[PDB]
Design an enzyme around this catalytic site. Structure first.
Site, short mmCIF file in Angstrom:
data_model
loop_
_atom_site.label_atom_id
_atom_site.label_comp_id
_atom_site.label_asym_id
_atom_site.label_seq_id
_atom_site.Cartn_x
_atom_site.Cartn_y
_atom_site.Cartn_z
N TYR A 84 0.84 -1.19 0.10
CA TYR A 84 -0.16 -0.03 -0.10
C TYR A 84 0.96 1.23 0.09
O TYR A 84 0.51 2.19 -0.39
CB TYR A 84 -0.92 0.21 1.30
CG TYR A 84 -2.16 -0.76 1.26
CD1 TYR A 84 -3.25 -0.96 0.52
CD2 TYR A 84 -2.20 -1.85 2.52
CE1 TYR A 84 -4.36 -1.71 0.64
CE2 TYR A 84 -3.13 -2.90 2.26
CZ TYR A 84 -4.17 -2.68 1.38
OH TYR A 84 -5.15 -3.40 1.71
N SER A 130 -2.24 -6.27 -7.01
CA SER A 130 -2.36 -5.39 -6.01
C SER A 130 -2.71 -5.81 -4.80
O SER A 130 -3.69 -6.60 -4.70
CB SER A 130 -3.02 -4.21 -6.43
OG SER A 130 -4.46 -4.14 -6.45
N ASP A 131 -2.27 -5.21 -3.54
CA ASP A 131 -3.04 -5.21 -2.43
C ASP A 131 -4.52 -4.73 -2.59
O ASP A 131 -4.84 -3.97 -3.47
CB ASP A 131 -2.13 -4.75 -1.33
CG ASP A 131 -2.66 -5.37 -0.05
OD1 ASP A 131 -3.77 -5.82 0.38
OD2 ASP A 131 -1.92 -5.16 1.21
N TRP A 132 -5.42 -5.09 -1.63
CA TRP A 132 -6.74 -4.82 -1.86
C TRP A 132 -7.01 -3.02 -1.70
O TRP A 132 -7.08 -2.51 -0.51
CB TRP A 132 -7.55 -5.47 -1.01
CG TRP A 132 -8.11 -6.93 -1.34
CD1 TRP A 132 -9.12 -7.41 -1.75
CD2 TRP A 132 -7.12 -7.92 -2.05
NE1 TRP A 132 -9.18 -8.52 -2.45
CE2 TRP A 132 -7.97 -8.96 -2.78
CE3 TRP A 132 -5.93 -7.96 -2.33
CZ2 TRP A 132 -7.27 -9.95 -3.36
CZ3 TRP A 132 -5.19 -9.09 -2.92
CH2 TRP A 132 -5.95 -10.08 -3.47
N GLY A 133 -7.44 -2.67 -2.81
CA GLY A 133 -7.74 -1.05 -3.09
C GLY A 133 -6.35 -0.25 -3.17
O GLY A 133 -6.50 0.88 -3.18
#
Lengths: 745, 106, 223, 112, 112
Positions: C116, C147-150
């Site tokens: 992130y 990607s990491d979430w969001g």
């Protein structure tokens, strides 16, 4: 004198020739227009006038002059007025030797314990340094003699000093290093400032235009001129354009260079004209202020030098009231440094004294005929090996005495200009003699003669330790008086004494990788570091003992809340609750309680010294202001106060606070908050428009106590663009775009 | 990634504090970086090539001030080449160093 | 020991029809206070890289993928989605990235998940030097980046940098990729290359799926 | 937890006190610690033994029983340093930074 | 090159990225900058992002928009940096090529 008239009558060469010296210590005269020659001469703490020697290293003998104590111990006096009197004596000696400008004081910050020239710098702390530096200049210049506030940049190590690159971030550079120079330039107005050999953030000091013009000339308003350290210039024309007026020593090529640059239209001649004006203004000043027929009493300066010294020595420890000594019985004085005194440094600050004391003779003197002073040598300053004959003689003497005073320290060859110490230890055969002499005479007093901190693994077997530093040509009477109590010790460490070398903040980055050193510890230099880390020192900054006691009482402030534009008065009462008179040093620190930026826990922000007879009490007064509370803010390129509570702390040391009080300072600067695509949901609650949408939100996010912690932590710190990923399509890049309009209008 | 020709020590321990056995080896780099002289190279840097230490002689003598033994050695070793201009009594100029830098770099 | 653990986890993914297991995590333990230290391996880049690599081997022996996780300097939780890790190149190479290097190279995890935070003023999900220059080119990672979430900041910039899969689903990012091709701002062959990486891993997990898989909850409690 | 860092490195207070009192009436004291990361141990002089069990998972019961009675021999070694106090660690001067910015200034000097 | 008042396939020329950047700058390699016809811009920030460097005539609100697009993180400042470089390049050129004291023959141009 109408100077712009004089400059207009000069040929192009005559102007450019003033821009460098005539030789190693004099300026260029112009006989056709009656511009005289004047003489520069070294000596931060004594005159080094060289009769006939082009020597910038103190290798050749010079005219003999008074050798006052070196910066390290005079700074420990915490006596703004004492050093100012010294500057007067120095100015009287420059007047007698026809010395126009005295090269000093030096005021660089003590970043590492190992820096070679720490003996001739004042402190690790920017406040105390600027005070002693400013009062130095004032005393010198009261007699009409100029000064050269020395090594303007971060000349904090000697290794590769002419090629090393000091890499310092903007906050650290302003708050720590440049602030030791700032106060002195502004209050004392020294006629010249000398630049350093190093680069600062990739540009040689001697042509760092932002440093010499931007900060020194434009911001701080220095009216005099800049002179290079000897040989420091890298290109003369680059140095002239950047704000360096005088190259030393004389280099004639640069004069041909300045000439050809005007002729090629690459250096505007009005930059050169402005430069001739600055130089000529200081040169005519020292002429107009020279007092012909000057004399001075070498007898009396040796008095003045004995006085400064006894205030410039820190009693570090004193168990069982072993000190001050009784004038009875027999006193065993031990150690070759008691016969071969260590009292100054080496390099361009080395003085040839006018008299010099005999430490044993002075101790014998003070003892009186009711006490016997004996002398045994004990160790060998020119060796690292124990001596079995001396050790038996020392032990035997100490066995016969009631008390033994052993002189130890660091031989002359350890501390010098041009190289830094390799370790922080005392010589080996000295440490051994302390331990053995102790094993047959526990009543052992140790005097250390040294210019900088050392390790003391032997400290348990010394009952007393007097840090005498480099006490100057009169350190004999000085130590005799302290030891017998005819003077009361009254000094406090102005640098921290670590337990081991590896404890200190520069250790991971000193001296660097080749021509590059990164000041990575940032604001955590000296006591600012040991406080934050809770790494206990061997002795803390501001530590000192006395033969009497002091009670503190009645902290008070005239106003309980000021705006950052306002000023504040602090008052405290000091009383001598002991039975000998003495002088006491009071240190005042400020503690920002909450700040959005990284800061040390305390910063020293004022001090005074005060003489008290038994039972006497007085009141000392401090003044705080914007700079007592502000940190440096590179974004607005100015100093900043953050609205809040700050704590005022009165202590006998940086470790020992006795009294506190909180005040409220309120900033006068209102900054507009500007929203953007990665502002947090918590950033919304800074405006009433923003918190309006904040409530409508955090519900548009779809997802019991156990996980209560992180659901708040999630929702407050998600960026506005991050809601796009967790709103079930309900919040898009177009919406955030509309939201950013509302938030910014 | 870069290896520097020298000695490295191999250490067998029960922890990072407790070494019980050690042994030294010699690793030798296969990379030669050409040294490039310039106006702020030290008098000590001249001793990396046989051309450079040739001129190194008497150039340290040209320093006219050639107990204080430790710091006089420290001075002479660490002056940059351009710094000699300030302490050679007019005997070393920018054109001389200019010619010197051509020779050293060929 | 950890390689047997990863095999058990792989046997649990086959019975639950789990294609790719998001893990292990191998971020470096810079501060003792970091919240997520319990699910990281060590402060030392070697020991970390070893355990992480053998984790990947055991899981992947059963034909199940992995997502070696939080590629960058995700070394603190405070303000992770907006924080900037300011790390000099030597420290970044010797310390932080070397915990990842050994595992990517020996174990060959099918995917790597980015973090992130920013590294040196650029969000991980769009640091082309980090996702393409070091992971794809230097280390030769064959799989794809997720990607990491969001975590994504701009979908089109992230594709150009080497991020193949945005999680979770964000449909605007698709319409943006399409418009970048048509306006001549993103070459359609950059996108073709991305589809080839993705489809290669997906058909792999399908073709390696073992239908009817079960597992003994009794023995995994022994394990 | 994920999503936030600890604010200090201490065990809860009402636990440290119980260790100290029980020690005063029973010197033969063994302490087992359940935690995901390092903690300070001002009580360590009064425990004769300390088993750091970390987060041992759904079968931590049998494992700790085995270790304590010797049916398994302990064979674990710390994979992080356990500082004496929080302020000793290399990140202390730059963690978590100034807003959205943290500078890894200690360089290669991380952990041991 | 001056852009027109009209739309081409539903997009105003002064903000048609494929037209000003895609074809004019990238494909054809135009080295100078794009200026609008007088009053043609519909949105200044849309126009900057698409390849129009100079809005004519002077419209000061567009300057407040470009600043806020940078500060709000919706326009990268290097897009603006690139645009200033194209503009400053043509301006300094015509300065440097100006011939001071220039005159001309109204008589001959009437012949011409």
């Amino acid at each position: 004198r109408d100077l712009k008239a004089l400059i207009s009558q000069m040929t192009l060469e005559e102007k450019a020739s003033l821009c460098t010296g005539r030789d190693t210590w004099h300026t260029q005269p112009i006989e056709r227009l009656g511009i005289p020659s004047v003489m520069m001469t070294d000596g931060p703490h004594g005159l080094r006038k060289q009769k006939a020697a082009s020597d910038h290293l103190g290798l050749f003998d010079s005219v003999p002059s008074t050798c006052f104590p070196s910066a390290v111990g005079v700074a420990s006096s915490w006596n703004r007025d004492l050093i100012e009197r010294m500057g007067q004596a120095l100015g009287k000696e420059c007047q007698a030797e026809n010395v126009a400008v005295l090269l000093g004081p030096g005021a660089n910050i003590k970043r590492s314990p190992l820096c070679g020239r720490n003996f001739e710098y004042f402190s690790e702390d920017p406040y105390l340094s600027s005070e002693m530096a400013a009062h130095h200049i004032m005393g010198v210049q009261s007699q009409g003699v100029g000064t050269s506030l020395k090594h303007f940049a971060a000349n904090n190590q000697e290794y590769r000093r002419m090629t090393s690159d000091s890499v310092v971030n903007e906050r650290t550079l302003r708050e720590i290093y440049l602030t030791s120079f700032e106060g002195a330039v502004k209050k004392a107005r020294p006629w010249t400032v000398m630049c350093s050999y190093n680069k600062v953030n990739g540009e040689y000091a001697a042509e760092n235009e932002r440093l010499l013009t931007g900060i020194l000339k434009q911001e701080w308003g220095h009216e005099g001129f800049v002179v290079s350290d000897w040989g420091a210039v890298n290109d003369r024309v680059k140095s002239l354009a950047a704000g360096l007026e005088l190259e030393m020593p004389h280099e004639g090529a640069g004069t041909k260079q300045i000439i050809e640059a005007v002729e090629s239209g690459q250096l505007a001649e009005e930059k050169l004209d402005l430069a001739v004006e600055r130089l000529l203004t200081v040169i005519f000043r020292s002429v107009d202020q020279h007092k012909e027929g000057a004399v001075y009493d070498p007898e009396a300066h040796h008095k003045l030098a004995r006085e400064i010294a006894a205030e410039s020595m820190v009693l570090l420890k004193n168990e069982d009231r072993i000190l001050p000594l009784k004038r009875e019985g027999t006193i065993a004085v031990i150690g070759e440094l008691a016969k071969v005194p260590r009292y100054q440094g080496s390099g361009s600050s080395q003085i040839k004294p006018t008299r010099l004391d005999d430490i044993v003779f002075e101790l014998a003197a003070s003892a009186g005929e009711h006490a016997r002073v004996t002398y045994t040598q004990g160790y060998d300053l020119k060796s690292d090996d124990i001596n079995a004959v001396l050790t038996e003689e020392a032990l035997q003497a100490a066995k016969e005495a009631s008390v033994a005073v052993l002189f130890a320290g660091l031989p002359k060859r350890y501390e010098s200009e041009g190289f830094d110490r390799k370790h922080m230890r005392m010589p080996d055969n000295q440490i051994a003699l302390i331990e053995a002499v102790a094993a047959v005479q526990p009543n052992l007093v140790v005097v250390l003669c040294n210019g900088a901190p050392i390790e003391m693994p032997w400290l348990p077997q010394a009952k007393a330790v007097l840090e005498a530093y480099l006490g100057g040509q009169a350190l004999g009477g000085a130590i005799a008086d302290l030891l017998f109590g005819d003077a009361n010790p009254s000094g406090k460490l102005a640098e921290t004494f670590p337990v081991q070398l590896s404890d200190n903040p520069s250790f991971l980055n000193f001296p660097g990788e080749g021509d590059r050193v990164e000041y990575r510890e940032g604001l955590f230099v000296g006591y600012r570091y040991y406080d934050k880390k809770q790494l206990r020192p061997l002795f803390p900054f501001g530590h000192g003992l006395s033969y009497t006691t002091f009670a503190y009482s009645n902290l008070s402030v005239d106003k309980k809340e000021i705006l950052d534009t306002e000023t504040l008065k602090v008052c405290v009462n000091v009383k001598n609750t002991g039975e000998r008179a003495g002088k006491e040093i009071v240190q005042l620190y400020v503690r920002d309680v909450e700040s959005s930026v990284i800061r040390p826990l305390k910063e020293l922000k004022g001090f005074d010294k005060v003489f008290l007879a038994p039972g006497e009490e007085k009141t000392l007064t401090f003044e705080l202001g914007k700079r007592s509370f502000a940190y440096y803010d590179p974004s607005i390129k100015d100093w900043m106060v953050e609205t809040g509570a700050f704590e005022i702390l009165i202590g006998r040391s940086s470790q020992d606070i006795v009294l506190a009080e909180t005040v409220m300072v309120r900033s006068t600067v209102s900054r507009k908050i500007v929203y953007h695509r990665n502002s947090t949901v918590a950033d919304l609650m800074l405006t009433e428009k923003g918190a309006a949408f904040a409530q409508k939100l955090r519900g548009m996010i779809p997802f019991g106590e156990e996980y209560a912690e992180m659901l708040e932590a999630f929702k407050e710190s998600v960026p506005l663009r991050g809601l796009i990923s967790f709103s079930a399509g309900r919040f898009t890049e177009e919406d955030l775009s509309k939201l950013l309009e509302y938030l910014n209008g | 990634w870069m290896v520097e020709t020298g000695a490295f020590e191999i250490l067998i321990g029960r922890s990072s504090q407790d070494i019980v056995l050690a042994e030294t080896v010699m690793v030798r780099s296969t990379v030669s970086r050409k040294i490039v002289y310039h106006r702020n190279s030290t008098v000590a840097d001249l001793m990396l090539t046989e051309k450079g230490a040739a001129f190194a002689q008497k150039l340290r003598g040209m320093i006219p001030f050639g107990e204080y033994a430790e710091m006089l050695e420290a001075f002479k070793e660490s002056v940059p080449l351009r710094g000699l201009i300030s302490f050679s009594a007019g005997r070393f100029t920018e054109e001389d160093l200019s010619k010197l830098l051509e020779y050293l770099n060929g």
